[PDB]
Amino acid sequence: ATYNVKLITPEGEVELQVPDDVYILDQAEEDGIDLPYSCRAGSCSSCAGKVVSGSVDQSDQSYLDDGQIADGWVLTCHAYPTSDVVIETHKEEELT
């Protein structure tokens, strides 16, 4: 399954076909979109995003607790899409 992943970035809205077994950041990269990251293994907040709609599987992450997950936060480096999903990126500083 490949899903439509909408990324709302400060430079503009970009649309990508991310397969279900590919991390969101890893496809962005393949398509030459510049997204933030550092650890790339789900244990920090550099790549943090907010799910506007649709859903992701991010069980591989370990930084965000559940209140934050319920609040729609997502770590783009360690998230596979599970539907067409719309994600605001570059949202780290909305925390730390």
Partner: protein
């Protein structure tokens, strides 16, 4: 089109001053992104402590520049005091023969760096898009090709030192120095535009306003001595000598690097290629020519592909050599035959060759703290020793009078420091990077997890029936950047998840061979499931004295995976 954010930052900075200068003195505990990128060039890194879950706690790591790993007595004393006074109580010896000092608060940063500069030290260029610390043989041998390797490394460091004066302007308000005059041959080589290398009118004759596309790493050694892990560097320089031991020239390798990134197969570790030979008088000209070739041609669009290794992978060694030869102004000669590489730890009690001794202090992970630290400083201060850091994160106590051997040996043993004979051989050749809690790139533990792993390796050896004098090179990193050069290990663990490693095999005791990735996402808890069959099969079928590394390359991953899956 196509230039990275870091390029624009360098461009706007007026040779690495702005806006670092104003950010340094703002009230906040951190500094802005531009300043974060710039402060690297002055040898400091803003970090945050990832053990503290709820909130960014900022601090600054500081890294020194110590060509050959040489550390003057005055500097050791100052760094030792700074670590306790303004840091977290430790000094960290590195795989490039440097110190790092973690945990400095922004408000104390200028005090710390100034103290370094006033105490025969520097942090200039310890990070940034420039020449990193230049490696040389750490041992204070009086042997000619060793001394000449060391001098050459120093000259190269000086050649490739930033000239803008920005450093002194920020940290020391511009003063001083005192320091040695730089050797005139270095100045001459640096100046010298007879082949179009330079920006004649610039405060940076070699680096220009943009500096390099990325960090750049050089290692110098004498034929046979691979303590420096030469094949890993942008440039490897090897002193060649005649039959009598008199240096005549240098062989040169180009285009190594460890750095890669998981699931980006266009990134990879690479071994440097033999480039050719130059007469000794030519060295700085050849080196500058190599650096200028990277300066002009390395990728500045995407930093992942900026290292010289990619340019050489893409161009091939022959086209690269011809390009370097434009800036060198003449032809490289053919690369001369070299003896086989040998690793040397330089540990234990040894002779300099002039009547004085040296003692190589084994330090796990280069982490010098609590007591070991106190005792080392007492020895170094009492006997006024210069010291030297090794590329295996160890410390050499240099210039020891023979009369002092016993009291030093007593003081070290009392502090719980050990002679090589009392260390597990796995520890002696093991390395790990700092990783967590202060590395922002770490995906798991390295330094904080390696010692328990080594003991579990020892327990696998014992179970299998392998003798306790046997060993394998183990190197662990918390991510695939490869700071402990894991891709050269006989057994490399490379973090790929919060509690998992990618296992790499095929390095050799010599570091003459590139490992390959054997398995991904091996959970910390499962390590024995892989290692036991591997080492059983090594014990069962190795040839006499055959290393685990050579055994791996002879037997092949296909047969090793079969053995691991059957288990």
């Amino acid at each position: 089109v196509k230039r990275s954010k870091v390029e624009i930052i360098k461009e706007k900075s007026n040779f690495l001053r702005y806006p670092l200068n104003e950010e340094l003195v703002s009230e906040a505990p951190n500094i802005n992104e531009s300043a974060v990128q710039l402060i690297k060039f002055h040898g400091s890194y803003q970090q945050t402590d990832r053990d503290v879950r709820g909130q960014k706690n900022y601090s600054f790591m500081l890294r020194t520049k110590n060509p050959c790993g040489k550390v003057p007595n005055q500097l050791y004393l100052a760094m030792d005091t700074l670590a306790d006074e303004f840091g977290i109580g430790t000094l960290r010896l590195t795989t490039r023969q440097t110190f790092q000092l973690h945990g400095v608060l922004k408000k104390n940063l200028k005090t710390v760096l100034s103290t370094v500069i006033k105490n025969m030290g520097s942090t200039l260029g310890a990070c940034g898009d420039l020449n990193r610390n230049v490696l040389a043989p750490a041992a204070p041998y009086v042997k000619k090709d060793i001394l000449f390797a060391q001098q050459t490394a120093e000259n190269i460091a000086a050649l490739l030192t930033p000239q803008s004066g920005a450093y002194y302007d920020l940290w020391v308000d511009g003063e001083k120095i005192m320091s040695a005059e730089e050797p005139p041959e270095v100045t001459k080589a640096r100046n010298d535009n007879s082949h179009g290398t330079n920006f004649p009118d610039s405060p940076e004759p070699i680096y220009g306003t943009q500096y390099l596309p990325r960090k750049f790493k050089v290692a110098v050694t004498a034929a046979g001595d691979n303590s420096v892990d030469i094949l890993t560097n942008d440039i490897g320089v090897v002193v060649v000598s005649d039959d009598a031991g008199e240096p005549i020239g240098f062989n040169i390798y180009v285009g190594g690097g460890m750095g890669r990134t998981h699931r980006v197969e266009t990134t990879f570790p690479r071994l440097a290629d033999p480039l050719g030979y130059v007469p000794k008088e030519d060295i700085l000209y050849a080196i500058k020519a190599i650096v200028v070739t990277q300066r002009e041609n390395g990728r500045r669009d995407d930093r992942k592909y900026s290292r010289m290794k990619y340019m050489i992978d893409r161009w091939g060694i022959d086209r690269f050599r011809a390009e370097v030869e434009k800036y060198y102004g003449k032809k490289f000669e053919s690369f001369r035959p070299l003896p086989e590489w040998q690793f040397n730890s330089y540990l234990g009690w040894q002779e300099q060759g002039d009547g004085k001794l040296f003692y190589g202090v084994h330090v796990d992970n280069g982490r010098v703290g609590g007591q070991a630290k106190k005792t080392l400083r007492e020895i170094i201060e009492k006997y006024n020793l210069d010291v030297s850091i090794t590329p295996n994160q160890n410390l050499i106590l240099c210039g020891i009078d023979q009369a002092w051997r016993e009291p030093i040996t007593t003081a070290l043993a009392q502090a719980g420091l050990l002679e090589p004979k009392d260390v597990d051989p796995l520890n002696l050749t093991a390395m790990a990077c700092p990783a967590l809690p202060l590395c922002p790139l770490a995906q798991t533990e390295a330094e904080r997890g390696i010692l328990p792993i080594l003991k579990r390796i020892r327990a696998v050896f014992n179970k299998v029936g392998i003798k306790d004098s046997e060993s394998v090179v183990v190197r662990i990193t918390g991510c695939p950047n490869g700071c402990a050069r894991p891709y050269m290990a006989e057994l490399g663990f490379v973090g790929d998840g919060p509690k998992s490693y990618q296992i790499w095999l095929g390095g050799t005791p010599n570091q003459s061979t590139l490992a390959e990735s054997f398995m991904d996402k091996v959970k910390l808890d499962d390590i024995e499931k892989v290692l036991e069959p591997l080492f059983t099969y090594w014990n069962g079928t190795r040839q006499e004295g055959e290393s685990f590394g050579s055994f791996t390359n002879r037997t092949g991953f296909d047969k090793l995976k079969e053995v691991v899956n059957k288990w």
